[PDB]
From a paper:
We identified two virulence pili independently critical to A. baumannii catheter-associated urinary tract infections, the chaperone-usher pathway pili Abp1 and Abp2. Further, their respective tip-adhesive proteins, the adhesins Abp1D and Abp2D, make use of large, distally oriented binding pockets to adhere to glycoproteins like fibrinogen, a wound-healing protein important in CAUTI pathogenesis. We demonstrate that Abp1D and Abp2D RBDs are structurally similar, and each binds fibrinogen and other relevant host glycoproteins important in CAUTI and other infections. These proteins share a common binding mechanism, using a large, distally oriented, and flexible pocket that recognizes a complex glycan receptor.
Author numbering: 1 to 87, 89 to 166
């Protein structure tokens, strides 16, 4: 089981990608926009007691994996996918969302330094236009503390707009 530090506070990344222009010629699979957002650790920590304890990068929108796979998930916009990941010298705790990794008992864990990456991807020949649905897109949490993640990423309002020509 994991114990969170007193005053443990989630870091939320606002996924303010902006306007993403898509051209009919853009090929399926193209990263239409790679947006990088700063992750500012804040001193929150946790430690766990069991080899079965885990930290999980989970995707909270209910959209399925896109036909392309490779962690490119569909969105409410046809032909537009989204892929998330955290970008330091810790490959065991990096990778495309979603993933889950084992934690070492007794190790005091902090939110790692780096950047949160949002990739908007063309997943079909023709793309829709509009705004990605708002809300939580990801949470990075330990087992038993899904309600208090290290890190979340959230779309507010029309922070990500697709404009297909």
């Amino acid at each position: 089981y994991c114990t969170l530090s007193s005053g443990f506070t989630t870091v939320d990344i606002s996924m303010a990608v902006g306007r993403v222009v898509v051209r009919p010629s853009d090929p399926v699979g193209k990263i239409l926009r790679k947006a990088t957002f700063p992750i500012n650790p804040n001193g929150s920590t946790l430690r766990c007691t069991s080899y079965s304890d885990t930290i999980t990068a989970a995707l909270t929108q209910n959209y399925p994996l896109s036909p392309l796979g490779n962690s490119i998930y569909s969105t409410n916009i046809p032909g537009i996918g989204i892929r998330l990941y955290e970008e330091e010298n810790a490959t065991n705790f990096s990778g495309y969302y979603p993933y889950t990794r084992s934690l070492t008992p007794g190790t005091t864990y902090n939110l790692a330094q780096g950047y949160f990456v949002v990739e908007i991807v063309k997943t079909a020949d023709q793309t829709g236009s509009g705004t990605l649905v708002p809300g939580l897109y990801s949470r990075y949490y330990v087992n038993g503390h899904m309600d208090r993640p290290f890190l979340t990423s959230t779309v507010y309002g029309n922070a990500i707009t697709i404009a297909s020509s």
